Design an enzyme around this catalytic site. Structure first.
Site, PDB file in Angstrom:
ATOM      1  N   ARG A  65       0.833  -1.192   0.000  1.00 20.45           N
ATOM      2  CA  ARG A  65       0.000   0.000   0.000  1.00 20.45           C
ATOM      3  C   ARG A  65       0.872   1.248   0.000  1.00 20.45           C
ATOM      4  O   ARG A  65       1.885   1.315   0.698  1.00 20.45           O
ATOM      5  CB  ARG A  65      -0.922  -0.005   1.216  1.00 20.45           C
ATOM      6  CG  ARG A  65      -1.866   1.179   1.297  1.00 20.45           C
ATOM      7  CD  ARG A  65      -2.864   1.174   0.153  1.00 20.45           C
ATOM      8  NE  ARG A  65      -3.696   2.373   0.157  1.00 20.45           N
ATOM      9  CZ  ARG A  65      -4.815   2.505   0.861  1.00 20.45           C
ATOM     10  NH1 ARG A  65      -5.244   1.508   1.622  1.00 20.45           N
ATOM     11  NH2 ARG A  65      -5.506   3.634   0.804  1.00 20.45           N
ATOM     12  N   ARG A  66       0.480   2.239  -0.802  1.00 17.29           N
ATOM     13  CA  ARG A  66       1.281   3.455  -0.909  1.00 17.29           C
ATOM     14  C   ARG A  66       1.198   4.304   0.352  1.00 17.29           C
ATOM     15  O   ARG A  66       2.155   5.015   0.681  1.00 17.29           O
ATOM     16  CB  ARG A  66       0.835   4.270  -2.117  1.00 17.29           C
ATOM     17  CG  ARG A  66       1.855   5.293  -2.574  1.00 17.29           C
ATOM     18  CD  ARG A  66       3.130   4.616  -3.026  1.00 17.29           C
ATOM     19  NE  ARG A  66       2.850   3.559  -3.991  1.00 17.29           N
ATOM     20  CZ  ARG A  66       2.796   3.744  -5.307  1.00 17.29           C
ATOM     21  NH1 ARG A  66       3.008   4.948  -5.821  1.00 17.29           N
ATOM     22  NH2 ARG A  66       2.531   2.722  -6.107  1.00 17.29           N
TER      23      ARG A  66
ATOM     24  N   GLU B  98       0.350   9.833 -10.135  1.00 16.61           N
ATOM     25  CA  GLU B  98       0.176  11.204 -10.639  1.00 16.61           C
ATOM     26  C   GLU B  98       0.875  11.418 -11.984  1.00 16.61           C
ATOM     27  O   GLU B  98       1.323  12.524 -12.296  1.00 16.61           O
ATOM     28  CB  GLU B  98       0.626  12.263  -9.622  1.00 16.61           C
ATOM     29  CG  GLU B  98       0.020  12.129  -8.225  1.00 16.61           C
ATOM     30  CD  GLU B  98       1.041  11.792  -7.148  1.00 16.61           C
ATOM     31  OE1 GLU B  98       0.990  12.424  -6.074  1.00 16.61           O
ATOM     32  OE2 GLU B  98       1.892  10.907  -7.363  1.00 16.61           O
TER      33      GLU B  98
ATOM     34  N   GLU C 219      -2.343  -5.996  -9.608  1.00 22.79           N
ATOM     35  CA  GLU C 219      -1.279  -6.960  -9.335  1.00 22.79           C
ATOM     36  C   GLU C 219      -1.825  -8.293  -8.832  1.00 22.79           C
ATOM     37  O   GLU C 219      -1.339  -9.354  -9.232  1.00 22.79           O
ATOM     38  CB  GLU C 219      -0.270  -6.378  -8.347  1.00 22.79           C
ATOM     39  CG  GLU C 219      -0.864  -5.571  -7.226  1.00 22.79           C
ATOM     40  CD  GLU C 219      -0.924  -4.096  -7.555  1.00 22.79           C
ATOM     41  OE1 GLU C 219      -1.420  -3.750  -8.650  1.00 22.79           O
ATOM     42  OE2 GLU C 219      -0.445  -3.299  -6.732  1.00 22.79           O
TER      43      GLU C 219
END
Lengths: 319, 494, 146
Positions: free
Chosen positions: A183-184, A213, A256
């Site tokens: 997770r970012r 982005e 993914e």
């Protein structure tokens, strides 16, 4: 002179104290990286060795470290203004004293300094003469004696002869593997740390490095996840909430899964700070991940956890 | 009142601590030591606290604590069997190491700190001893040699794992200072111990930007060295320098770094000469980071009157040379901004098509590199791009008016720097530039010398060594030898 | 009067757009954005229109649109899901790229234009994004490389 080239704490202290007991002023130690000097440092050098009356000519011609290390007798005789041969011989003596002390970390490539200093301590003074011409430990086995007379600047014939006879002898006589999804927002730290812990054991690994982005779809990240042998998943506290019943591309962790599961490779989940939810908070393609089990990470015996996570991959039959 | 209080601040702080530092000195009480420790810790956190007065009141106070015979007390209490007295003594020892006390600690204490480096578990211990090692790496090269050779680096590389937001700053500054003032051997033994790999979790944390700045600075100083740049590039942590620098502002980190360390007016001259050698290197990340730090420091030091240190060091010529050959948007922007903060005028970038130049462009070139007094002779003889690329020493000596050999050698150095940058799209035919640059980056400077004579990739297999001495203008015999031996092989083999 | 109107032309154009550019800035209306868009497009087609005055009145106006924090608004509206707001935002973005604003667009925006380069079918989209790429090829060598 003992203070200026001080490579020790005791004799430097005693020397400074003994000079302080007399009216002579204390010199300052000089930086050992002789290339990339400027005019000021050259001036202070000429102020400490005793050639203090020639500082004017150097400040006039704007000599630096590089131009100092490659001086010849002609420039001393003609425009720098050292007419007498005995002053020139003193200057070269001091200079060669300095050039065995310098640090050639930014010019040398194959550590040629060491290979020279192994023959004779006095042989390090020519190393910049070799490096600035372009030689190294792979290209010395086919150089001539004349090619050292004017290109590299070695004048004494005995020294050229020994360098040639010692080099001519020496010819040789003396797609990623795994992938990591995470997770970012949270779980950046354990993702980085798992990357370095896997890479230190000999497995290559490719991690996502700030793609968002920008162009995000089909942007050279979808072949990576199918061409990687083993797949890894980072279960941070509150990391699966955003993909709860959206089944779109805005859930950056979803694709993914849907592709690594299509290929059918090993997906090891990392259990840390969170356990699995009820099986209704995920779509029909995401019922499988809720059932898998993985390693329970701990912040105390990390090395044991890595020793155990190695086996859970295809490490038995990788590569 | 700072020029008045140099007697007044010290006449109100020494009055009380002068007795309290030894008030409880012989007492072997378990809970008795802590009170005096906390008292002194409060005072040293008071000296630094009040702004615009804290520099001298801190430094003279620390010197008095040195002269009073209290360092040995700390070095004793670091070996005490109780643990909370150890952690309080360490946290007090963190705040005293200034440029003079550090010499005495490096003289006597150095073994007990290494003895403390084995104790890893209590966090308040590690948080202070990391700062102790941070301050002790700045002393000398022998001290760095000892701390790398007695196992004092392993402590740092193990403490890089944990997640404390104040331990990691000390850890990053420790690795940065060690690589900066260390030397050659310590660097090799640092990269052998996989220190380039361990910096990656420290630079990828998206929680704070000071950690990322210090990690990138450390990896750039390690990657400036030529011997172990292959290892560092294989580690893969150099790719994370560009985005970070591109996504920040020097103006906001200006007004930072003025309160954190010691509330000082920036870094010293001898600290500032540690950045300029990484500003001139054939790497891009290094140049970007260097530009960033210099811009920030220029911001902090241009509010004051000190605008001469950046001319004494020689950053103006390097920044102008960085602007003139700019092949990137980030470092060009930062460089122009840093030159705009000073009175030096901004240069303009120059066209990379060096042939088909005229007299004006040559003049601007000679105005940017520094040979500004010889512009007259060039405008007189009407030199152009073509006539510039084929200059020899005779024309410099005779009619252009460069008598001294050292000026001629500077001119040729600048010129060969320029000729590896030019664009030979209108003279070359068989892309001879690329085939030269494949052998050695320094070998592109002769390509026009070959093209204007008429050679190409089909006609090189039958040229001699003498035919390169005066026709093409290659002087170094080693270079001629390598060109011949690499071309004579290639008939159609690659 | 060109050497006089350098204060006078800017003292009659900024008065109205200075509020209208953000008058409808937070409104997520589908048909609401278009009106302000058309308004600003009319003004930038007014600055260029009157001869012998249009150079400075255009360049200073564009610089003020840069300094007002409105480029990010355009870069947002280029990613909107509706199509007619996209084409109106693109046709407005065509008329602003002068030698100073182009640096900021090359700094931040460059990815969304490439994201728009995949949409080929609507003609009013292509007619403006072609001019956007035309003006963006003139900036630097790295921009051309990208």
């Amino acid at each position: 002179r003992l203070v200026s080239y001080s490579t020790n704490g005791t004799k430097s202290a005693l020397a400074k104290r003994a000079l302080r007991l007399l009216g002579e002023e204390v010199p300052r130690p000089i930086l050992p990286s002789v290339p990339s000097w400027k005019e000021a440092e050259v001036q202070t050098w000429l102020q400490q060795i005793g050639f203090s009356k020639y500082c004017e000519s150097f400040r006039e011609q704007q000599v630096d470290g590089d131009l100092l290390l490659r001086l010849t007798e002609e420039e001393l005789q003609t425009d720098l203004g050292m007419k007498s041969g005995i002053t020139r011989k003193r200057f070269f003596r001091e200079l060669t004293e300095l050039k065995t002390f310098a640090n050639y970390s930014t010019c040398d490539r194959s550590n040629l300094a060491d290979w020279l200093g192994s023959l004779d301590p006095r042989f390090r003074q020519y190393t910049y003469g070799l490096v600035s011409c372009g030689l190294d430990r792979s290209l010395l086995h086919r150089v001539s004696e004349q090619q050292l007379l004017e290109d590299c600047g070695i004048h004494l014939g005995v020294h050229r002869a020994r360098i040639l006879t010692a080099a001519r002898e020496m010819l040789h006589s003396p797609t990623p593997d795994v992938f990591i999804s995470y997770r970012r927002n949270s779980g950046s730290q354990l993702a980085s740390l798992l990357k370095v812990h896997l890479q230190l054991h000999g497995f290559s690994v490719f991690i996502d490095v700030e793609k968002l982005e920008a162009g995000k779809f089909e942007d050279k990240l979808i072949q990576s996840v199918m061409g990687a042998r083993n797949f890894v998943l980072v279960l941070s506290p509150g990391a699966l909430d955003k993909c709860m019943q959206d089944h779109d591309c805005k859930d950056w962790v979803h694709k993914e899964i849907v592709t690594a599961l299509s290929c059918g490779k090993n997906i090891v989940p990392i259990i840390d700070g969170f356990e699995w939810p009820e099986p209704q908070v995920l779509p029909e393609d995401m019922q499988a991940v809720l059932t898998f089990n993985g390693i329970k990470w701990s912040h105390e015996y990390q090395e044991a956890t890595i020793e155990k996570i190695i086996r859970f991959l295809q490490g038995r039959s990788s590569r | 009142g700072a020029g008045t209080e140099v007697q007044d601040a010290l006449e109100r702080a020494l009055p009380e601590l002068q007795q309290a530092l030894s008030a409880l000195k012989q007492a072997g009480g378990a809970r008795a030591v802590g009170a005096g420790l906390a008292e002194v810790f409060q005072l040293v956190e008071e000296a630094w606290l009040l702004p615009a007065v804290g520099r001298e009141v801190a430094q003279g106070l620390c010197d008095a604590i040195r002269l009073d015979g209290g360092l040995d007390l700390l070095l004793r209490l670091l070996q005490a069997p109780e643990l909370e007295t150890r952690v309080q003594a360490a946290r007090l020892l963190e705040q005293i190491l200034v440029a003079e006390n550090r010499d005495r600690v490096a003289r006597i204490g150095l073994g007990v700190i290494l003895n403390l480096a084995k104790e890893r578990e209590p966090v308040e211990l590690a948080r202070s001893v990391a700062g102790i090692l941070e301050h002790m790496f700045k002393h000398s090269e022998e001290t760095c040699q000892r701390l790398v050779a007695a196992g004092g680096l392993d402590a740092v590389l193990y403490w890089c794992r944990r997640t404390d937001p104040a331990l990691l700053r000390h850890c990053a500054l420790a690795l940065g200072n060690c690589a900066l003032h260390g030397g050659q051997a310590v660097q090799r033994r640092m990269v052998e111990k996989r220190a380039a790999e361990w910096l990656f979790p420290l630079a990828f944390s998206k929680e704070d930007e000071l950690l990322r700045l210090h990690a990138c600075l450390a990896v750039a100083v390690l990657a400036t060295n030529k011997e172990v740049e292959r290892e560092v590039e294989r580690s893969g942590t150099l790719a994370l320098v560009e985005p970070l620098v591109a996504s920040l502002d020097p103006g906001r980190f200006a007004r930072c770094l003025v309160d954190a360390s010691d509330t000082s007016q920036g870094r010293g001259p001898d600290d500032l000469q540690r950045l300029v050698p990484l500003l001139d290197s054939n790497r891009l990340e290094a140049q970007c980071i260097g530009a960033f730090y210099l811009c920030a420091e220029a911001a902090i030091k241009s509010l004051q009157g000190k605008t001469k240190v950046f001319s004494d060091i020689g950053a103006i010529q390097s920044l102008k040379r960085l602007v003139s050959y700019s092949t990137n948007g980030t470092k060009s922007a930062l460089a122009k901004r840093a030159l705009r903060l000073l009175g030096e005028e901004v240069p303009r970038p120059i066209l990379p098509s060096v042939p088909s130049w005229k007299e004006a462009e040559v003049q601007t070139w000679l105005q940017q590199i520094g040979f500004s007094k010889y512009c007259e002779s060039f405008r007189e003889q009407q030199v152009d791009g073509d006539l510039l690329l084929r200059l020899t020493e005779e024309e410099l000596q005779t009619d252009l008016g460069m008598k001294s050999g050292i000026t001629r050698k500077r001119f040729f150095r600048e010129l060969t720097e320029l000729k590896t940058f030019a664009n030979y799209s209108t003279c070359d035919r068989s892309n001879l530039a690329d085939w030269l640059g494949s052998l050695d980056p320094r070998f592109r400077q002769y390509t026009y010398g070959l093209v204007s004579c008429g050679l190409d990739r089909s006609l090189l297999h039958r040229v001699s060594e003498q035919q390169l001495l005066e026709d093409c203008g290659i002087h170094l015999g080693v270079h001629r030898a390598r060109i011949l031996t690499a071309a004579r092989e290639m008939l159609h083999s690659p």
